[PDB]
Structures are given as structure tokens and as C-alpha cells.
Nucleic acid binder design. Structure first.
Ligand SMILES: [Mg+2]
Ligand SMILES: [Mg+2]
Ligand SMILES: [Mg+2]
Ligand SMILES: [Mg+2]
Ligand SMILES: [Mg+2]
Ligand SMILES: [Mg+2]
Lengths: 79, 178, 114
RNA sequence: CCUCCUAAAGAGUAACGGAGGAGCACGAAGGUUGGCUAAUCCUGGUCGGACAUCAGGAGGUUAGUGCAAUGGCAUAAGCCA
RNA sequence: AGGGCUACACACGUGCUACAAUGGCGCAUACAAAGAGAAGCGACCUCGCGAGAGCAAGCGGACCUCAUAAAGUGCGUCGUAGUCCGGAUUGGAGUCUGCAACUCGACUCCAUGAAGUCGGAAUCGCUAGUAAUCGUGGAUCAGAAUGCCACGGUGAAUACGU
């Protein structure tokens, strides 16, 4: 997940996750910006992360931050 | 009797002003150490038993008491005899003396010790906690030794309650944890 | 001598031998001799007291043996009990470094399961 | 041939009645002296987990008795030397 | 827009790298060919363990750059051990590319160091600068080569016979 120096996330979440902070914890954040990185303000929030067919819920936890929002949503179906 | 004396003087009074024991003949004393080390197996090697024994006869200057099977029947083999381990309790002198080399050097010769349970007690006041593994303490050539070991030790104190059991033990340099 | 992990990597060379330490390698082993003031051609076995003494002392810093082989699981464990593609891979024994599972994976996952 | 019921609280009593065993085993599994006491459960303990050994408590012949059944057994016949 | 064509319990083809001492590792160090390049090659020096970053020369090329070839030779070390072999795997952290590195990039650092001790039946290429082996360049292309095309170094064995 290298990126040298500069954590990046699509504009969508950046404006959505921040708004959730003030508005308060509520419905998830329907988005496809899985390629983005998880932030601390996202912790405790809900985000509808799309995978292939439909989106999926997410429980932004402490340690679950520096990671990409996408790695927490399997896409393929095996057995 | 290092801890022994320490008990009389230092300890005792601590409990006397704690639970307010009206009689000196009430302060939870130390009721022998137990030790067990159930090497089990045996049926397979039969030698890992004597090894465990000797390993026990090490930490303890007294000869180990090779136990025997009881029910025999089990989810495995095992019969009437079928040796399994060697308890070998402790007695005052050798006891405290051991209770010394323990916590003062045994527990110290940790593995990653960072806090001892405070619920290893039974419910009557006596405690019990298996080291989960022979800390390789003063054994025959710590490096030139047998494959691991591991054993269990039961405090067993004349405490009328687990609560008082906490005061005791901890009354000494007993590690523990919060 | 026990050095650290009790290991007795002697009768060889300070470097190559010290590498026996579960936590040190060709790099750390050949470097520790610097702060420990030890050569390379020196047989750990022949090493005078202080010689090995310095070793253990300097290696006391960098994490090795137990703590490593131990804590090394903490990280892996995390992802696992985390719910990320990383850990998810481990439980399934599949390649985490993103390899081709279609074929060639005998190392990562079991060999033959016909 | 041995045990229990049938067998009407002494003994005994039948059926092609209802049930189950013997045709042995031990130089110790005999003798004696000395000593010991189960089963099962709960609580707590390296690996010991349903159940291996250890500590505590409840419990009390529910254990065991060389092999059927009945009767007997703690002063133990039960167990160890 | 996100994802899938990179999925897996499997089987077959083509390859790469080892199973070591005709070797590994250290240090020193001799020789080549063919090529490539203005949205490109990029020196020099500053730093970074290194990938790489900063400044910025030179070249649109028998001037510059890519770009101190490898095997090898001298010495030293190892001593035949799953071993200073071999490197898969995985963990921690980084460099750069690109909106964009989860799925699914290449590479660097430290640690970890598996299988593997030359492979059944069967089967493939190669008759000389060939086989074998050792490095080097390019097209594609932002960035993902063990592949494809090309270049040179060293350098055999054997062929009665059908
Ligand atoms: Mg009668
Ligand atoms: Mg009558
Ligand atoms: Mg229990
Ligand atoms: Mg394809
Ligand atoms: Mg190019
Ligand atoms: Mg290219």
C-alpha cells in the first residue's frame, strides 16, 4: 500500500466521513472509494463499501485505520 | 526459614491489623507447597517419567512420589497401575526454603512474566497455579537438560477464605497482578 | 555460550555463528561485532569471557528469539482477528503477498491435496 | 453342580415355569503383623481434554469383593507392605 | 463507477532458480558486441543502509547518457554439513510510478530461510564457434518480464553404421 509520503482518499469520503463526525454516527457511507485509506474520524462510523454486486457495511475500529478502506471487503466468491 | 521468620514478624501482624485477628493462632499460615508435574504419557516412553521425577527431585531435595492411575478407563488407554506423575509436596523448612527459590528466583527466571493471576485460588483460601512450563530453574545443566517439562504447584493455605488467601502470599514478595 | 536464546553457536565464526540467534542475520550478526568490538574470523568457542560478554550485552537491545518468534504472531494475528485481506489469507493458508493460486503454491498452502 | 424368584415371614416343596452361572483360578489371590479407605460430583490448577496425575470441599459401604446370584464385609473379607 | 479477465481442491504444456566445493562468500581486478534516447538518456556532486530524492552539465548522438559486462584471474575464507548451499514464505518498514498500488505494481532495507542432497515410467534440443554456459541491449511501455527479439564472452563430446 506504499504511497511514499501522502495518504490519499477520494473526495467523496473525505467530505462524507467528515460530515458524519458532526452530524453524528448514523447510516453508513455508500461509496466505491475503497481504494482510499481509512481515517481515525471514521472509527465507529458505518460505510457502505461496494465490492462488485452491492456495497457492504464496515466497523471502522482503532487499528483499522492506516489500511485501505478496500482491503476490508472481499470481492471474489470461492466455494 | 527466611520467609518463615519473615512471616512471624513482618507478616502475621499485618493480618492482625488487617482482618483484626483476636488471636495470633488465626493468622493464615503456610500449609505446605504441593508440586505435581503430571508427565502422563509414560505408556509411550516410560523414560520421560523418571526424567520428570528427577526434574522434580531437583527443585525439591526430596525423592519424588511417582503417582498411579485411578479410574484406568479413559478416552485413551490407562489401566489400574499406569504411572502418570509425581506430586511431592513441601514441608515447612524445605517448603518455605522452596517458597523462597520460588518467586525470588523461580518466577524471576520468567519466560515473559508480566503479571500473575489473582484468581488462581480455589474458594476455601488455598491457591494453585501451574507454571505452564518448567522455568528451567536450578536443574542439572540448564542447557544439558531433557525436552521441556512443565508442572503444577498448589499453594494450599490454612486460610478460611480465598479473600484471606489474597492477603497471605501477597503478604510476601508474591508477584501477582492487578 | 547461551548468549541469548540459550543457543550455543560456537566452533565457527563470530558472524556466521551469531546469526544462529533467531533474531539476527548476516547483517545484524556482522554489525554487532562493531559495538561489541569483535572480529569475524574469531571462533565464538575460543572467545574469551568478555568477548562473548559484550555480545549478549549489545544484542540485549534488538528484539530476538522468543519475543520475536512470539510477537511476530501478534502482527499476523491482528490482521486475522481484524478482518482484512491480509489475515483472511493466513487462515485460508493462501498466499498473502498476492500470488497466483491457480498453480504453484505448494509452499504457502499444503503440497498435494488430491 | 451353584444362585435368585415361584416357595403362603422355620426346614421343604412341582412344571418342556421366569432369570443367570460351574467342569475353574491363585505358592499368592494362602497365613500372620502392622498400616490404609472408597465411588461420584463441585472448585481451583503445564500441557489434561468428557474423563490421566495435583490441591480443597461435598459425599458417605452409591466403591471394591478373582468369575453368576444371593447373602455378608469398616473389628473391614476391601487395599498396601 | 466499482469489480472480474491476477479467482482455487486439482491436472498438463513452456520456462526460471537450486539441490553446491568445476561451489558459496570477501576483497582486488582484464578483456566485448549490439543497441537506445527532446513528454527521452540523464552525468556531476549533496544526502539516504539502499531503492531513491536535490541541484543541475552534456546529448538529439563514432562527442553526451543509459553504462565500472559476466564468466573469469590472484589471494583469502569455508570444508561437503541440508550445511556460509538454496532461496520459496511471511512479518515490520520504506522508494518510485502514476487520480489512482485493497482486490492486483516493480523494487529497497532488516528479520524469517521451506521444499529441494540431480528427479520413475517416459521424454526434448543440439553435429562447431554449434551444444553447454556467462553477461548485454531492445520493442511494448506511466509503471509489472524468469517471456519475445537481438548481441557478444568462454567453449566441448560424438557420428562404425541405417
Ligand atoms: Mg421358606
Ligand atoms: Mg410358611
Ligand atoms: Mg474440575
Ligand atoms: Mg490471463
Ligand atoms: Mg527504454
Ligand atoms: Mg522497458
Amino acid at each position: 500500500r506504499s504511497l511514499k509520503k501522502g495518504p490519499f482518499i477520494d473526495l467523496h469520503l473525505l467530505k462524507k466521513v467528515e460530515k458524519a463526525v458532526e452530524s453524528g454516527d448514523k447510516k453508513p457511507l455508500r461509496t466505491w472509494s475503497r481504494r482510499s485509506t481509512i481515517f481515525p474520524n471514521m472509527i465507529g462510523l458505518t460505510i457502505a463499501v461496494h465490492n462488485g454486486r452491492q456495497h457492504v457495511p464496515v466497523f471502522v475500529t482503532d487499528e483499522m485505520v492506516g489500511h485501505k478502506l478496500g482491503e476490508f471487503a472481499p470481492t471474489r466468491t470461492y466455494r | 526459614a527466611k520467609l518463615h521468620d519473615y512471616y512471624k514478624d513482618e507478616v502475621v501482624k499485618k493480618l492482625m491489623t488487617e482482618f483484626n485477628y483476636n488471636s495470633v493462632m488465626q493468622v493464615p499460615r503456610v500449609e505446605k507447597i504441593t508440586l505435581n508435574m503430571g508427565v502422563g504419557e509414560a505408556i509411550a516412553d516410560k523414560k520421560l517419567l523418571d526424567n520428570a521425577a528427577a526434574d522434580l527431585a531437583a527443585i525439591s531435595g526430596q525423592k519424588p512420589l511417582i503417582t498411579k492411575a485411578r479410574k484406568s478407563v479413559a478416552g485413551f488407554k490407562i489401566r489400574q497401575g499406569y504411572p502418570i506423575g509425581c506430586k511431592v509436596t513441601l514441608r515447612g523448612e524445605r517448603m518455605w526454603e522452596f517458597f523462597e527459590r520460588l518467586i525470588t528466583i523461580a518466577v524471576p527466571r520468567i519466560r515473559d512474566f508480566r503479571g500473575l493471576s489473582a484468581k488462581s485460588f480455589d474458594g476455601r483460601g488455598n491457591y494453585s497455579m501451574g507454571v505452564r512450563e518448567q522455568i528451567i530453574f536450578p536443574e542439572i545443566d540448564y542447557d544439558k537438560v531433557d525436552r521441556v517439562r512443565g508442572l503444577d504447584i498448589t499453594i494450599t493455605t490454612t486460610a478460611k477464605s480465598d479473600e484471606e488467601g489474597r492477603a497471605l502470599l501477597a503478604a510476601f514478595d508474591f508477584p501477582f497482578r492487578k | 555460550a547461551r548468549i541469548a536464546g540459550i543457543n550455543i553457536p560456537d566452533h565457527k565464526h563470530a558472524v556466521i555463528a551469531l546469526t544462529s540467534i533467531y533474531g539476527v542475520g548476516k547483517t545484524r550478526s556482522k554489525a554487532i561485532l562493531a559495538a561489541a568490538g569483535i572480529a569475524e574470523d574469531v571462533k565464538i568457542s575460543e572467545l574469551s569471557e568478555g568477548q562473548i560478554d559484550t555480545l549478549r550485552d549489545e544484542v540485549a537491545k534488538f528484539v530476538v528469539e522468543g519475543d520475536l518468534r512470539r510477537e511476530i504472531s501478534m502482527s499476523i494475528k491482528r490482521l486475522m482477528d481484524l478482518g482484512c485481506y491480509r489475515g483472511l489469507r493466513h487462515r485460508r493458508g493462501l498466499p498473502v503477498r498476492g500470488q497466483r493460486t491457480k498453480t504453484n503454491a505448494r509452499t504457502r498452502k499444503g503440497p498435494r491435496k488430491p
